C-alpha cells in the first residue's frame, strides 16, 4: 500500500550511499541493466559526459520496463548494488515521479540525502567531529555562517544562488522535466518543456537580476563570446561520497574543448540556430522543415535544443546548453587527465551558487529572446481587456508600498544525509533572505453590465537603473517577474480584489522534511514536486536595501474565458506553483506566454506608455531589516 | 624528567588538532605573547607567506626561553589554549630538537599525526567511511592504489615524489634548521646550514633527475625565466584540519605578483646575487664588503639565498628561495580573494610530489652552480691520494653487477592522525619502490710500506643519456648522487674493502612510529632527526627499468687525517644519516664541499679521462622488478 | 569544387609554406609539398587524422553491425596462433641495404654511388587457423585478419571502437572449407597489402617477364619489411583479430588470375578490375562498436590471438 510504499524507500535512503556496493557477482541479472559498465562505484561522474549517459539510456531502459509496484522495488534493490549511486536516484526519482502506480510516494528530499552539496565542508566536518567530541545522544547544532575576509562583492548576493530551497527547486524541476524523457517508450508527454525550459531560467536569472541591482550592483553579463574569461569561484563544498570535494575556479579562465565536443561545434551549433530564427524554420532528423510559429514552435525548439530526447535535431542544434555546462565546469581539467571533481555546474542542485552560471543563462535566454524578438510587439487591441478599468492597486504590509525583508536563521538536519553513529541530530543552522506578509487591494471599473471573469498576471520589477531611474520597460523585461496569476470575477461598477502574499501562484508553501514523512500529513498525494518544487517562500521579494529601494509592481488584467484551457484534469492540488512550474498531468493554465505582457518588444520608452486601463504599475519600496 | 617529558607535549599532540580551541578569557597572562593572535584558527596556515614566518619567529623566540623543562610545559599547556596549531608544531618541534633540557625525547611523527598531507582524500574518507559503516572495534585497511584513467606520463614518478619518507625527511630537514634560526638569542649556531642547504637539495632533485631518465624521460627543467607557465597538478589531498583541500594547479599559468612582492623585485634580487659571484663580494646589513671565498662562500651563498636570519642581506638579496615558492603555490590565487588554500609548494612536507618543485630547485642550484662554476677546476695533484690505488670496484646483489628494485606495500596508521572513534587502526597500504641489498668489493694497492687511513666517497650517475650512451661527467654531476662515505684503513699491498647496503651514510636505517614511542626503546634518546631525518632506504637506489639500465658507481679514496675534522664531540650515534642531513653538535666531518668531486667544473668529456688512480667507476644495472 | 574545396590538399599548401605562404623570399616549402617526401615530417599525419575524423563522421552516422550481419553461419573459428621461430611472438630486425645514387645523380666516373641505410623488418610466420565447418556442405570464405594493439598507453584496454584506428588489415583471402574440423595455414608473403619484388632500374634496363603492367605492379602495395611494426625489445603484446565472411556473397563478379599490384589487392587493389570485397575496406572495423571489449565483439567467425612482436636489437 502507498504507505509501506513509503516505509521501503525512505529506509533505504535511510543513510544512503554505501548500498551502492553489494553483493552482484553477475550484472546478467538485469538484461535490463547488462549493458552499463565503465563507471565503477566513486569514479566521479561529470553528468555531461557523453558516454555516462548512453551507459543510463541503457539503465533507463531497463528499470522502465517493469511489471506492478513490487517489481519495480525489487530492480530498485538490485541494480542499487553496483551503480553510481547519483544517477540511480536521477533515475528512481525520474520514475517514482511518473509511472502510474505510485501516488503519494514522495522523493527523499536531496538537501537532506546530500547536505554536502548545500553546505560548508565546515560545518559537516564540524557536526561530524563534535559526534566524535562527545560520543553521547545530544543533538548538535553549528552555525553555518563562518568568518573570513570579504574582499569580494559577490558573497553578498550568497543569500540568494546558495539557499536550499533555491538549490532543490533546480533539481527537482529537472527530475520533474528530464531530457531523457522519451514520450513513446514511456507512454506520454511533457507539456510545453522547451518554452516552461526558457521561463522558468528567465525567471531565475530575473529575480537574481533584481538582487544584483537591489545590491547596487548592475545585472548579469551574458556569456555572449566563448573567449572571454570565466569568473573565479569557491563553493566551500566537499562531497560525503569520498574525500575529495568540487575543485573551485579561478578566474581568468579561458575555455577549453573537450574529448567529447569542440568549442568550436558548439559555436557552429550556435550559427546553425540563429539563421534558423532569421530562415523562421528547423529541420528535424528526417530533414523536412517544420514552422518556427508562435505555438508550436517553442516546444518543438525547446526539445531540438536540449537536447531532449524528444528532440528535433540533436547533431544539428547540439545540445548547447548542457554542452556549454559540461566546458564551463570542467574549466580546470577537460581532457581529465587528473581526475578533479568538476565545478559546481555539473549538476543541477549546485549550480546556483557559482556566479558564471548566470553569464551562460542570459546567453540562452539571448538566442530565446531573438526568436521571440522577431515576433511583432503587441497591439494595444491584443493588451485591452475591453470595459475593466484597474482604478488602482496598492500593498499594505506594516505601512503601505513598502515591504519589509528580513534574516531567519534556521536548520537542516544532516544525520539524515551523512552518519550520526550516536547523536540524535546534527544541525546546521543556516541564516536566510525573507520578507513581510503583504497584500494586494486592487480597484477596479467594470463599466460592462455583465460581471467580468480575469485572470491577473501581477509583477515585479526595478524603478531605478544603476545609471538613474530609468523606466525603459523593453530593459526591465529582462528584470520583470511575475509575482502571482490568478482569476477573479468582477461584477459591474466598482470592484475591488485583495490577495495575500501566501497564495502567490510561483512557490512552494509547505516544504516537506523526511521527518513528516516517516509519519504522513494530508496536502496531495503527489511526488518530486509536492514539497519541494515551486519557487521559495523566503526569495518571493527581492532584498532591496536597508533605505528602502524602489521597484515596480505592475499588474495586468486579461480575460478568463479566453485564457483558461478547457479540457478535463483534476481538483484542486499540486497547482500551488503554477507560474514556475505547472501543475500535475495538466497544461500551463493560461494561452499566452509565459511572460506575457513581457514576452515581445517595446518601442516604448515608459513602463507608462504600455499603460492600457486593464495596466496597472504601484511603485513599491522594500526595505532589508539589518 | 625526560620521560614525563615526553608524557606531556605528545599527549598535548594526541589527536593534535583540536587543543587548538580552549579557553583563555583575556590573553594578558602571556605579557610575553601580546601581539599574536592575528590568524583567526583554521584561516589557512600558508607557511610561507611572509608574515607566517615572522608571526612563527614569535613563536620561535618564545617557545625556546622557558625557564626549565617544567615551565616550558606549562607555557605550552597555556598558549595552547587559543592558537594555530600548524606553527605550534613547528615552533615547538624547533624547540624540543635543540633546548638543551631535551634528550630522549621524541618529535611525534608528522606522517601519523598529519596522514593528510601524505595520502589520497579518497583513503582518508574511506577508512573514516568504513568506521561510520560497520562500528565495531575492528581494523581497517585500505589499499591506497586507486584506479585512474592515466593519461599523464608524470604520474610515474609518483613513486618517488609523494613518498611517506621523502615528504617527513624533507620537514625534518628545515626543522633541524629554521630559517628563523637566530644563533645569539638561541645561544649556539647550525653547522653549515646554508651549504648543506644547496646539497641537499640538489641531492634531492639528482636523484630524481636519474628517476626522469630511468623512465626514459629527460632530466628535470629549471624555472630559469619568469613568464614561462607551471605544470598542472593535483596532489588529490583534502586536508584533516577542516572540509577544505589543497587547491590544484592547472597548466599553463604565468607566475604572478602578491602583495608582499613583486615578480620583478624577486627578478631584481637575482641580478643583484649573481651580480655579485661576478664581483666575488657580499654587502652585509652594515655595508661591508665580506669575501666570497672558495669555501664559506657557499654557506654565505646558501644563507643568503634562503633567506635565513642568518642572511647576511635580506633587503638586498630577498629570500628568492622561499618566495619563489609563495608565488609558485598561490599560484591559483596570489591577490587571495578567494581564501583557496594554496598549492602543495606552502609547506615543505607536501612539496615534493608537484612537478614544479624541481623546476624552481635546478633554478637555486644554477645560482649555487654559477658560484661554484667561477672557482676553478680540480688539480690532478688535488685529486690524488698518492699511492694508493683502486684495482677495482663490482657490486653482488642476487648476480654481479645488477641491482633489482622492488615494490613493497605498506602501512600508515591513520588512527594517531584521525579520529578512530571506534576501531583499533585504520591504515591506509601503500605501495613503494625498494631495491636489493649488495655490496661493494672494492680493490687497491697501498704501494707505500705504510698503512693508509682513506675517506671513500662512493656515487651513483647514469652512463645513458636520454640521447644516446655520453659520458660527460660535467653534465653528469647534476645527476651524480653519493651512496657512501667513510673511513677504511689500509695495510700495504693488496687491500679488499667490502661494504653492505645498509651502512649507507645517507640515509635512515630505522624509522619509528608513534605506537614504538608509547613504550620507548635505547637506539640512542636525541629528536626530530633519530628515526625520521636521513634519506630513505628504499629510495637508496633509482628504478631503473624493466630491462636493466645502465649506471654508473663512480668512487674517490680521499685521505682520513687530511679528511676528518677534529674536536671533541660525542659517541657513535645520529651519524646514520651523516652525509644529506649531519650528525648532532658535530659538524659536516669531511673537509672537502658536499659533490667532491663533483662540485666544480671538469673540462673533461669522459668520466674516464677525470680518472685519478684512486677513482673507480664500476658500471651497474638497476632493474625494476615488475 | 567551391562549396566542397579541396580541404585535404589545401591543408597541404598551407602546413608546407607554413615558413612563407606569401612567397616573397622564395625558399622550397616544407616536404608536405609533394607526395614522395611526405610522410617523414610528423605534421602529416596530424593532418591525416583529421580528415579521417571527417571519415569517420560519415561512417559514424551509419549504424553499427548486426550480430546478424557479422555472422558467417554455421563456420566455427576453433582458433588461430603464429609460429615464427616459436609460437605467438614475430621477431622484427634491422637490414642495412643499399640505392643507387648513379641513375639519379652524375656519377661522372665511377659505376655507382650507394647509400647504405637500415631499415626494420621482421621474421617469416603462418596463420594455423582451425575451423568447426558444421555444414554439411564446403564453405568457400573470405578472411580478413588484421592486427591491433593490446595494450594502451594508459593500461591493458581492449576498446575496440578505440582499437579501430590502430587496426590494421594484415591479410584477406578466399579458401575453402570442407565439412568438420579445418586448418587453413598461411604463410606471411602472400600478405594481400604488400609487395613482394620490386624491380631495380638495372633489372628493367635488362629484361624478365613478372608479367608487365606498371607503376602499381612493383612500385606500390605496402612494404614488405614494415608489414608488422617494431613492438619493442621486451616483447610488446598486440592484437591478431580474424573474421571468416562468405566468398559467394564478397566476390565481385570474375577473381583476377594476373597478378597486376594485385599482390597487394587490399592498400591499392588490382588492374582494371575492382575491389574484390564487397565489404567498406576497414570491415568489420569501419563502424561504431558500442561494446567495451573486442572479445564481446566476438562472433564465432571472429578470432583474436594475442602475439608479441620483439625488435631485435
Given at each position: 500500500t502507498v504507505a509501506d510504499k513509503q516505509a521501503r524507500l525512505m529506509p533505504l535512503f535511510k543513510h544512503l550511499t554505501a548500498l551502492t556496493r553489494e553483493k552482484l557477482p553477475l550484472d546478467q541479472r538485469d538484461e535490463r541493466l547488462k549493458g552499463v559498465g565503465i563507471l565503477p562505484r566513486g569514479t566521479l561522474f561529470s553528468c555531461f559526459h557523453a558516454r555516462h549517459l548512453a551507459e543510463a539510456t541503457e539503465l533507463y531502459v531497463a528499470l522502465y520496463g517493469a511489471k506492478d509496484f513490487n517489481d519495480f522495488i525489487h530492480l530498485c534493490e538490485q541494480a542499487r548494488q553496483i551503480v553510481n549511486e547519483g544517477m540511480f536516484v536521477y533515475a528512481v526519482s525520474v520514475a517514482v515521479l511518473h509511472?502510474?502506480?505510485?501516488?503519494?510516494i514522495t522523493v527523499p528530499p536531496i538537501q537532506e540525502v546530500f547536505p554536502d552539496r548545500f553546505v560548508p565542508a565546515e560545518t559537516i566536518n564540524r557536526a561530524n567531529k563534535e559526534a566524535s567530541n562527545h560520543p553521547d545522544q545530544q543533538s548538535i547544532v553549528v552555525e553555518a555562517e563562518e568568518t573570513g575576509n570579504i574582499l569580494d562583492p559577490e558573497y553578498k548576493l550568497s543569500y540568494f544562488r546558495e539557499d536550499i530551497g533555491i538549490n532543490a527547486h533546480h533539481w527537482h524541476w529537472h527530475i520533474v522535466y528530464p531530457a531523457t524523457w522519451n514520450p513513446t517508450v514511456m507512454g506520454k508527454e511533457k507539456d510545453r518543456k522547451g518554452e516552461l525550459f526558457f521561463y522558468m531560467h528567465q525567471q531565475m536569472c530575473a529575480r537574481y537580476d533584481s538582487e544584483r541591482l537591489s545590491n547596487g550592483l548592475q545585472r548579469m553579463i551574458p556569456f555572449h563570446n566563448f573567449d572571454e574569461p570565466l569568473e573565479g569561484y569557491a563553493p566551500h563544498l566537499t562531497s560525503l561520497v569520498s574525500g575529495l570535494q568540487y575543485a573551485s575556479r579561478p578566474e581568468g579562465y579561458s575555455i577549453h574543448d573537450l574529448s567529447d565536443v569542440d568549442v568550436q561545434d558548439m559555436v557552429r551549433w550556435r550559427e546553425r540556430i540563429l539563421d534558423a530564427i532569421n530562415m523562421h524554420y528547423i529541420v528535424d532528423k528526417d530533414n523536412n522543415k517544420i514552422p518556427l510559429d508562435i505555438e508550436h514552435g517553442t516546444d518543438i525548439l525547446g526539445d531540438i535544443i536540449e537536447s531532449s530526447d524528444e528532440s528535433k535535431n540533436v547533431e544539428y542544434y547540439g545540445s548547447l546548453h548542457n554542452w556549454g555546462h559540461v566546458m564551463m565546469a570542467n574549466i580546470t581539467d577537460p581532457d581529465h587527465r587528473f581526475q578533479e571533481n568538476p565545478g559546481v555546474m555539473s549538476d543541477t542542485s549546485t549550480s546556483l551558487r557559482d556566479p558564471i552560471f548566470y553569464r551562460w543563462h542570459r546567453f540562452i535566454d539571448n538566442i530565446f529572446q531573438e526568436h521571440k524578438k522577431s515576433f511583432h510587439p503587441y497591439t494595444k487591441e491584443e493588451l485591452s481587456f475591453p470595459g475593466v478599468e484597474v482604478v488602482g492597486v496598492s500593498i499594505n504590509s506594516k505601512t503601505a508600498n513598502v515591504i519589509t525583508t528580513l534574516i531567519k536563521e534556521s536548520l537542516l538536519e544532516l544525520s539524515h544525509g551523512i552518519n550520526f553513529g550516536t547523536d540524535q541530530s546534527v544541525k546546521v543552522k543556516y541564516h536566510h533572505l525573507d520578507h513581510e506578509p503583504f497584500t494586494y487591494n486592487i480597484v477596479v471599473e467594470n463599466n460592462s453590465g455583465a460581471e467580468k471573469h480575469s485572470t491577473v498576471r501581477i509583477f515585479l520589477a526595478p524603478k531605478y537603473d544603476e545609471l538613474n531611474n530609468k523606466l525603459e520597460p523593453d530593459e526591465q523585461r529582462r528584470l520583470f517577474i511575475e509575482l502571482d496569476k490568478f482569476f477573479y470575477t468582477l461584477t459591474p461598477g466598482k470592484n475591488t480584489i485583495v490577495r495575500n502574499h501566501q497564495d502567490s501562484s510561483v512557490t512552494i508553501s509547505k516544504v516537506r522534511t523526511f521527518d513528516q514523512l516517516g509519519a504522513g500529513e494530508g496536502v496531495s498525494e503527489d511526488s518530486t514536486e509536492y514539497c519541494s518544487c515551486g519557487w521559495p517562500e523566503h526569495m518571493l521579494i527581492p532584498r532591496g536595501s536597508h533605505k528602502g529601494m524602489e521597484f515596480e509592481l505592475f499588474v495586468m488584467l486579461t480575460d478568463h474565458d479566453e485564457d483558461t484551457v478547457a479540457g478535463l484534469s483534476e481538483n484542486a492540488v499540486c497547482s500551488d506553483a503554477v507560474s514556475y512550474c505547472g501543475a500535475r498531468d495538466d497544461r500551463y493554465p493560461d494561452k499566452k506566454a509565459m511572460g506575457f505582457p513581457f514576452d515581445r518588444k517595446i518601442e516604448a520608452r515608459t513602463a507608462a506608455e504600455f499603460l492600457t486601463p486593464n495596466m496597472g504599475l504601484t511603485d513599491i519600496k522594500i526595505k532589508f531589516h539589518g
Open positions: 509511472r502510474e502506480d505510485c501516488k503519494g
